[PDB]
Amino acid sequence: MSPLRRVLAELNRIPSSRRRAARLFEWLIAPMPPDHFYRRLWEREAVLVRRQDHTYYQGLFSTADLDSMLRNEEVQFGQHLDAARYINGRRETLNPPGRALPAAAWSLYQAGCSLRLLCPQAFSTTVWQFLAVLQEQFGSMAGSNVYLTPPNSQGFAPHYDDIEAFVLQLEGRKLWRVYRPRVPTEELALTSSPNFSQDDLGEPVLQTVLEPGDLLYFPRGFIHQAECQDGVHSLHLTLSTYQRNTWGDFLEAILPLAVQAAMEENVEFRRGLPRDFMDYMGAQHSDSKDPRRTAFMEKVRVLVARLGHFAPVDAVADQRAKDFIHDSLPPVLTDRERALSVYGLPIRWEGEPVNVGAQLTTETEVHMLQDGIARLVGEGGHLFLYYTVENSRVYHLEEPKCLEIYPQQADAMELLLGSYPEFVRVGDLPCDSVEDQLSLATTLYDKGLLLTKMPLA
Amino acid sequence: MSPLRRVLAELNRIPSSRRRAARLFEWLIAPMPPDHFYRRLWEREAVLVRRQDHTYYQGLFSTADLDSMLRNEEVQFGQHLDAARYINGRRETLNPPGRALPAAAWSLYQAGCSLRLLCPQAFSTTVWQFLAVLQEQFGSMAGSNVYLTPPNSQGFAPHYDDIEAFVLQLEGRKLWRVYRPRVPTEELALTSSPNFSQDDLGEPVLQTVLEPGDLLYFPRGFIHQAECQDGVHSLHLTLSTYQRNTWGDFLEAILPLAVQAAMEENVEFRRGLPRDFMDYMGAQHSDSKDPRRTAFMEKVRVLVARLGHFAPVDAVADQRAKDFIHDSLPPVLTDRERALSVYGLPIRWEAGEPVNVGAQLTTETEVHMLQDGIARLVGEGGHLFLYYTVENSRVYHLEEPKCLEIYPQQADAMELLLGSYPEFVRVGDLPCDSVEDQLSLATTLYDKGLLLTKMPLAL
Amino acid sequence: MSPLRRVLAELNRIPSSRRRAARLFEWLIAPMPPDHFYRRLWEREAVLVRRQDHTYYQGLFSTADLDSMLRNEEVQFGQHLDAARYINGRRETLNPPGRALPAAAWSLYQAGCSLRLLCPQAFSTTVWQFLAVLQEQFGSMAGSNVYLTPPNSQGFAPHYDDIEAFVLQLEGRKLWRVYRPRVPTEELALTSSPNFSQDDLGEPVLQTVLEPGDLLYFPRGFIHQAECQDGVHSLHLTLSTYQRNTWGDFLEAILPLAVQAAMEENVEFRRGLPRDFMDYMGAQHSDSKDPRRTAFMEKVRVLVARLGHFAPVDAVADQRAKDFIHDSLPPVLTDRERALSVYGLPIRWEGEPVNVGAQLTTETEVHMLQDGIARLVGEGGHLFLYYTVENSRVYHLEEPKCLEIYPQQADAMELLLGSYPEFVRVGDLPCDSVEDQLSLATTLYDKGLLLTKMPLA
Amino acid sequence: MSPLRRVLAELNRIPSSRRRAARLFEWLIAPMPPDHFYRRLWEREAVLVRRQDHTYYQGLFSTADLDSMLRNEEVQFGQHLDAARYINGRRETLNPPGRALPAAAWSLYQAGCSLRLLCPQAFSTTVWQFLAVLQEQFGSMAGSNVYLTPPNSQGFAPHYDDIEAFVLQLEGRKLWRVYRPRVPTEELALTSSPNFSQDDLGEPVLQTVLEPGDLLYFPRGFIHQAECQDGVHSLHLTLSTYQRNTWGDFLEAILPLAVQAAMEENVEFRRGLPRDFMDYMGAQHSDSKDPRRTAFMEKVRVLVARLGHFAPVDAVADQRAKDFIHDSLPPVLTDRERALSVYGLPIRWEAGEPVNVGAQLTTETEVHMLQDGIARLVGEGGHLFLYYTVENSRVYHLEEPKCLEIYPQQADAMELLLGSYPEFVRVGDLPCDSVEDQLSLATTLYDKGLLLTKMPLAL
Amino acid sequence: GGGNHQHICKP
Amino acid sequence: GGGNHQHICKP
Amino acid sequence: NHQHICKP
Amino acid sequence: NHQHICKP
Ligand SMILES: O=C(O)CNC(=O)C(=O)O
Ligand SMILES: O=C(O)CNC(=O)C(=O)O
Ligand SMILES: O=C(O)CNC(=O)C(=O)O
Ligand SMILES: O=C(O)CNC(=O)C(=O)O
Ligand SMILES: [Mn+2]
Ligand SMILES: [Mn+2]
Ligand SMILES: [Mn+2]
Ligand SMILES: [Mn+2]
């Protein structure tokens, strides 16, 4: 049994989804300790993990799967598959309009083009599970792409990306060159870069031949390029994450709401500007020595500084959570979670509906299906429980799913989220009455957001 | 000659437009010094200036002017005129649909309704010049509303507005009641308030009967209400200004640009958020004893503070200025400025052909901006634009941002003219690259009505 | 007193606005009889009327008025004034951005450019009255433009227009050349034409030197060009009308509503098309001899023909009327109509409001202010009275003004419209009660849509 | 082997797609002849075909298939599944928000609710091929809904639909009641009707218990309703077609183009309207004895009639065809068509490289459209486009109009292939200008999956 | 009062 | 319950 | 040329 | 290049 099939079988035996995500990431970067990686490597340095086990990823994704994907699934050019080649220091994309048929796709490949599948998780359920579990421990959307390059060619021009990348070598061998940020403004870049020429690059901080089973990580801002040598092709899956999840983005949300709270709660932000500040403020007077100008600048900085007091941090913290619940991929349930949830109710069609009518009781012991499926957020004057269970494997195919949580149950809905994975007896919920304890539990269970210790009858 | 007519005659004799605005404000609050007012009264206290001269505002606006207006103008109900009454502590607005004909308007008035003429500066040229000049020294759009209340009635319910108000009593008399901000959040409020009941009010910080000529000023947030008592009506013009012109409104623009710049210029803002911050941050955790939480709040405050270094102050200043040029009312020229500008060129049609054609600017021409509050140079994406107000309608935003691009070869000169006001500059002395660059600018400005020559041109 | 000032003084003494419009048109084309013109000339031939009275139009519009317009009014380039010149067989437009100041306008003029004022009726009240009265007898919007050309020059390239044109020579002399439609498709053109070269033109059907006081009429489709000779300029006002007021446009409205009524009232329009009509219909088979194709064509024509039965003619007739009420310019009232309407109520400010409180009585004799101010139209399940009284002198500055007419008054509102200019005693209206007779009368009067025989007290 | 499985096996053995569609329809209404049906029954009468073979539809769709679907697919309530019940003569639809999980769906079913699976062709490949083939001989989009009703209940209130319906009984039995159009306007109605009460109904023109295998057909406008009575449920698939495919709908497109053309080609339509027609035309004059009125009506009728000569029939035909290619479901290929098309090229990944690469079309290649209802050549503004259905989703309009431009140098050839079906054409014999024009077309079509070679390519 | 046969499948 | 001072004049 | 519409 | 978004 390959290390992957084995680690997956190992994950199916782990109760907590949080412990399941941790363990999976632990497996992805092994032997390297996750605490060391996140402390010294993450967002800091480029890292290569020499696995020395060409079967490490066996079962994840292969070229045969991609080939089977072009034949069965409705793989679309541009929308899903991309074909590109790098020649004479120029990036060219050969993308015919329409569906990507095996005959056309392999034609481009044989022609020296590289193929990139944009949404592997939408086709491969294995990749979905991988990303779906790894995202819970990233606290951010775990995207992914698949690159297939033919022998002796380069599909992409040097460049950097706007996400933290984890390259997994699946088949073949490939020569990689990773560079550290060229200038200060490129370190942890906000946006992806254009395609670079060899003249723009300095010396590689890392240059290696990734072998199947190896992992290569590098931060956003780190330029990189790879190429296939004589005799063999290459196939890798690049796991990405942390796109626009910086402190700056958090601020972007905080600030507008901050200046608003302040203007409402503090008169100093409601005081009128100078009747003649235009006489000394502006590019035109950027060189003026008018003392009033320095007073203005001083007043601005002082006021800006005072915003940290009015910043609705927990609010924006929830909004980002809501957006993440929205960005997340649907959860992959373990056999146990399935059997103990609505998804595993023995209610089927045998004739007539058999085993129909399972009822939750004040005795039933329950707890959230997983830890990263739901998030409680308060918008307007109401409270809503956002969840991922009904999310598509296609980024934003569906829209923000939620259900209104009434105050009489808020305390109980908050408890359930916090006490995971501890089984809570429904009858002992922090609500006003039994009708409020059963409704919530029933409403959640039927949604497939909750599970019971023992299968319902 | 009424004080208004005299002061206006005076403004025409004053060369600087900045000085006219100041002088006119001086006249408005006289005998009170503008200096004292802006330093102690403005946005702080309610003020009453018992003029003791019922002719002070003669020539400004009269009830007769209103009657003539509803008759000779297309005064639209709801759009230009509001008829309303206050009774039983309830505010009612009975605005007939359509044009406000004298017959209908006076019928409502007779019925006990107050008439409020929303944009008097659109129908009255005298009121226009008044505001057009006052806006310059206010450094903010100056607007106004005229209120005509019949005897023994109240048109509006007590409330407060979102602007600085200068109530001018034009005819009759009225009993006013002004209150200080009821609570902290109401002090210098951001938006107008709803209609209030007498129960929501405390004691008046000022209660008086305004007589023609008097001026009653009060800051946004100050509740107020008026009414007629004896068998006499009331007519006043409320000049308003400083709407959304606060420090908070300036920060609204700054922040996004700041945070953006901070992210592009400082890696600390580009660092990723904690992987598990949602575990201790959020409404359901406003009480957590998790240290990582306090560290989070601290990091936010530290980053917020650091924004002061990335704030594009000059940029937002110019944008607000640009928006001001846009909100501004067209400039009211002095006979002097006119005769010396393109507007006063003697070229007109006579007999069967244009007469006195050929006015040409020369390098020997001494010039300077037609006025100090008509133009503003602003940069935008490597492009430099000169926004002006000379083509604005007397109707707020009835027109759109008018400008003309300024090429780098003129930037220095254009920047000069804007600061040299009102000092005459020989065109041949403008800091450009070529003589064709000085004449092109000067010509392009003169013809646009943004410049004025020291002597009329006859070449 | 000039013929115009005299005809205007004559119009102010004519009760019916319909008789007032007729008379004015009679004056515009005199000595030519209006019945002859509309019968043999209108839309058929180009006509020149040699007035032999250079004072005929004195008072209408002059260059001094235009000059006074650039100085006082806010005349805008492009929006209002247009400056163009015709040289080397090419039409060039010199339109600087911004306001048209006398200095700039006369500069272009002296340069050899021609000036065209697009909305003379918005500035000149005389032109407004003219157009406002002439439209009532055209049954269509009476637009207008003013052209001023300097000596020895041509402002416009040859072309035709999409409207019936009446050129009025105001000052100077100008050489005109009018051509008859070049080809069948140009006769009574739908849209204005591009600018033509001299090679596109045939021989002029008319070539004359229009003298002040003369009138030159020519149909849409008739190409034309004018030019000023040696020594003098030219100034004319071109009165236009009948834009998109053809039988085709009436159909455009009728047809959609026709096929709809038919499909609802006749099953033959609800019968399914052939299951295989695509095998023999279409450009591809435009050459096929399949008999079914001829059957299809036959079925189409037969069905189309049957639409005349379901055509909601009166409905579209009203919609066009509503649109015309909307397009119309505000009415110009005669002293009498003014004195006998709300606009002449002696209610003013003398102190206090004096003479306030005029009341209509069941004895009051009333009748529509004019004939072309209001139109009754039924939309939805309701009836509305559309009127022009509140219209701006600027095409569509305001929007469709109307007031809901309740059924209990419909019969009375229909009567008032039909009995004009007959004075109807309010007490003898076809309504259900006195409350219904006074309300309507009062509602109309106050709107300035009605007048009384004797001024109210 | 069930009749369905056999007939399907038969369709695969038939070369022409036009013949498959026909043959499949023959199978649907058997023993009744398609000829007789379309000539006497279609859009005229309600029809019942007592099959007397409960296995007739075996393989099409089953309740088990539905159970597996709600479990393995993302069946959304309201979007894919509708649960409803009819009681007290009131129609109620209790659609829980969100995904339809087996537990919830079966709970509603147990409660007396009928389940209606809106787009079965999206989740079932068997149903897809069924409709994908039937649409070809219908010359109109063929859709369907599956209905599952529990014992002793009625899911829907009596009503009529806007499409031609073919009810197929799959499991259990149900009591049906079909009525003829209540009034003239309801005959072949344009839009679906509201929910009706038994009071609005007359006597049934047909009332019967449908048994698995039976087919009940009825035209739009025919009211109907069904219910289960004994302790047995019911499952049927209602195939529908001919929505908005009437003569009136064809005229809707024609007229505007007609009147337009008529105005551009005939001066009679460009003549101006009467100056005073509003004097005798209008609702307030529907009675006027004015002769000019009768002349008006006559002129309208005369002009309306004259439009028949300006009608762009071929244009509207192609547009409707284009819209049909768009509404169509993707074609279901026969093993033959596949193996001989681009879809059946043996080129796939093996070992470490693509195997069997290099299939090249030649001038000696005999070809012809992959099928007869997959493409349609349409002109638009000097541009010629070939619209196809091969890339359409099984979800109606989930994709947009797919096409590829055809240059004039190919128009004749492309027009040939469309009519030559299913006759093989040597590529070197296509009517083009150059050999590069025949290969470019043939190649561009083959690779797109719109063509099929007589023999598999191995060059 | 919900609707009936949904032909177009949009839904 | 109508509004109050209308500063911007749009109206 | 001759624009029948007062103002665009 | 590497598009983090599944499908645009
Ligand atoms: O494989 C290549 O040629 C380029 N790959 C990448 O940029 C990547 O995996 O992020
Ligand atoms: O005159 C009144 O009754 C109320 N007036 C005002 O609120 C004002 O002038 O700002
Ligand atoms: O006067 C000109 O040069 C052109 N005039 C016109 O086209 C006109 O009056 O309709
Ligand atoms: O099955 C039912 O109760 C109703 N069925 C239909 O209306 C149908 O199949 O078109
Ligand atoms: Mn039905
Ligand atoms: Mn106020
Ligand atoms: Mn013309
Ligand atoms: Mn990359």
Residues B271 and B361 occupy one common structural domain? no
Phi and psi at B441, nearest 5°, equal -70, -55
Cα torsion at C283, C284, C286, C287 (round to 10°)? 160
Q: E strands along D264-388, which residues?
A: 348-350, 353-355, 366-369, 375-380, 383-388
Q: Which residue has the tokens 């007592």?
A: D50
Number of domains in chain D: 3
| Whole-number Å distance between alpha carbons of B434 and B421 | 23
Given a contact cutoff of 8 angstroms between Cβ atoms, the answer to whether B112 and B179 are in contact is no
The H or E element containing residue B168 is strand B164-172
Given a contact cutoff of 8 angstroms between Cβ atoms, the answer to whether C46 and C206 are in contact is yes
- The SS3 call for residue B144 is strand
A68: exposed, middle or buried (Cβ count in 10 Å: 0-12, 13-18, 19+) = middle
Ligand 1 neighbourhood includes A165 CB (under 6 angstroms): yes
Sign, CA torsion D436/D438/D439/D444: positive
Within its chain, how far is the Cα of C444 from the centroid? 25
Q: Do chains G and D touch (3 or more CB pairs under 8 A)?
A: no
End-to-end CA distance of chain H: 13
| Whole-number Å distance between alpha carbons of C44 and C60 | 28
CATH code (residue A21): 2.60.120.650
Angle between helices C291-305 and D291-306 (to 10 degrees): 160
Q: Six-digit token pair at A246?
A: 């910086």
Q: Six-digit token pair at B435?
A: 């003589």
Å between B312 CA and nearest CA of chain F: 28
| Contacting F residues, span 1-11, partner chain B, CB-CB under 8 Å | 1-11
Please report the number of interchain residue pairs, chain A to chain B, with beta-carbon separation below 8 angstroms.
219
Residues D139 and D216 occupy one common structural domain? yes
Question: Strands C114-117 and C81-87, how do they pair?
Answer: antiparallel
Residues D304 and D320 occupy one common structural domain? no
Report the residue of B192, B196, B244, B400 to disrupt the F interface, i.e. the one with the largest count of F CBs within 10 Å.
B192
Residues D255 and D220 occupy one common structural domain? no
The H or E element containing residue D244 is none
- Answer left, alpha or beta for residue A59, where phi above 0 means left and psi between -120 and 50 means alpha: left
D chain contacts of residue A102, beta-carbon cutoff 8 Å: 345, 347-348
Question: Strands D425-426 and A164-172, how do they pair?
Answer: unpaired
| Whole-number Å distance between alpha carbons of C133 and C121 | 12
Ligand 4 neighbourhood includes E6 CB (under 6 angstroms): no
Distances (CA, A) of A215 to A51, A57, A137, A167: 7, 10, 18, 6
User: Length of chain F, please?
Assistant: 11
Given a contact cutoff of 8 angstroms between Cβ atoms, the answer to whether A441 and A360 are in contact is yes
Q: Which residues make Cβ contacts (< 8 Å) with residue B72, sequence separation at least 6?
A: none
C-alpha D94 – ligand 4 centre gap (Å): 17
CATH code (residue C388): 3.90.930.40
State the CB neighbour count (10 A cutoff) for residue B335: 10
Provide DSSP, D178-237: E---SSGGGTT-SS------GGG----SEEEEE-TT-EEEE-TT--EEEE--SS--EEEE
Residues C270 and C365 occupy one common structural domain? no
Pocket of ligand 3 (CB under 6 A): C 114, 147, 149, 154-156, 161, 165, 167, 226, 238; G 1-2
Which segments of B are annotated as binding site for Fe cation? Answer: 159, 161, 224
The bound ligand whose nearest atom lies closest to the alpha carbon of D161 is 5
| Whole-number Å distance between alpha carbons of A123 and H7 | 12
Q: Which domain holds residue A304?
A: 247-310
- Resolution (angstroms) stands at 2.5
Comparing alpha-carbon positions, the chain A residue that sits nearest to D149 is: A352
Question: Please, what is the Cα angle at C324 between C320 and C326, to 5 degrees?
Answer: 120
What letter does residue E8 receive in the DSSP assignment?
S
Report the neighbours of B using a cutoff of 3 or more CB pairs below 8 angstroms: A, C, F
Ligand 2 neighbourhood includes F6 CB (under 6 angstroms): no
CATH code (residue B294): 1.10.10.1500
* Residue C53 labelled as part of a binding site: no
- Find, among A172, C44, A187, C96, the residue nearest to B271 by Cα: A187
Residues B187 and B319 occupy one common structural domain? no
Of ligand 3's listed atoms, the one at least distance from the Cα of C147 is: 1
Å between A345 CA and nearest CA of chain B: 31
| Whole-number Å distance between alpha carbons of D140 and D160 | 20
Residues D185 and D66 occupy one common structural domain? yes
Residues A180 and A36 occupy one common structural domain? yes
State the CB neighbour count (10 A cutoff) for residue B94: 13
Q: Six-digit token pair at C386?
A: 């559309």
Answer with the one of D279, D310, D341 that is the final residue of a domain: D310
Q: Six-digit token pair at B254?
A: 């700054």
Of ligand 1's listed atoms, the one at least distance from the Cα of A167 is: 9
Within its chain, how far is the Cα of B122 from the centroid? 14
Residues C277 and C222 occupy one common structural domain? no
| Whole-number Å distance between alpha carbons of A413 and A382 | 14
Phi and psi at B423, nearest 5°, equal -85, 125
Q: Which residue has the tokens 């005798």?
A: D280
Residues D131 and D266 occupy one common structural domain? no
Given a contact cutoff of 8 angstroms between Cβ atoms, the answer to whether A4 and A60 are in contact is yes
- Residue C210 forms beta bridges with which residues? C174
| Whole-number Å distance between alpha carbons of C307 and D185 | 17
| Omega before D181 within 30 of 0, i.e. cis | no
What letter does residue C390 receive in the DSSP assignment?
T
Residues D40 and D150 occupy one common structural domain? yes
Does the distance separating the beta carbons of B95 and F1 come in below 8 Å? no
Provide DSSP, B3-69: HHHHHHHHHHT-S-HHHHHHHHHHHHHTTS-HHHIIIIITTT--EEE----TTTTTTT--HHHHHHH
Report the residue of C134, C186, C264, C300 to disrupt the D interface, i.e. the one with the largest count of D CBs within 10 Å.
C300
Residues D371 and D325 occupy one common structural domain? yes
Phi and psi at C128, nearest 5°, equal -60, -50
Q: In what order do the strands lie in the sheet with B174-178?
A: B206-210, B174-178, B224-227
Question: Please, what is the Cα angle at D100 between D94 and D101, to 5 degrees?
Answer: 125
Question: Please, what is the Cα angle at A253 between A247 and A254, to 5 degrees?
Answer: 80
Comparing alpha-carbon positions, the chain A residue that sits nearest to H3 is: A118
Max Cα-Cα span within chain C: 91
Q: Which residue has the tokens 């109904």?
A: D201
Given a contact cutoff of 8 angstroms between Cβ atoms, the answer to whether G5 and C395 are in contact is yes
Q: Six-digit token pair at D403?
A: 């096409």
| Whole-number Å distance between alpha carbons of C182 and C202 | 7
Answer with the one of A198, A227, A246 that is the final residue of a domain: A246
Report the residue of D349, D388, D405 to disrupt the A interface, i.e. the one with the largest count of A CBs within 10 Å.
D349
Cα torsion at D20, D26, D29, D30 (round to 10°)? -130
Amino acid occupying residue B99: R
- The SS3 call for residue A92 is strand
Amino acid occupying residue G4: H
Amino acid occupying residue B218: F
Answer with the one of C205, C230, C246 that is the final residue of a domain: C246
| Whole-number Å distance between alpha carbons of C432 and B313 | 71
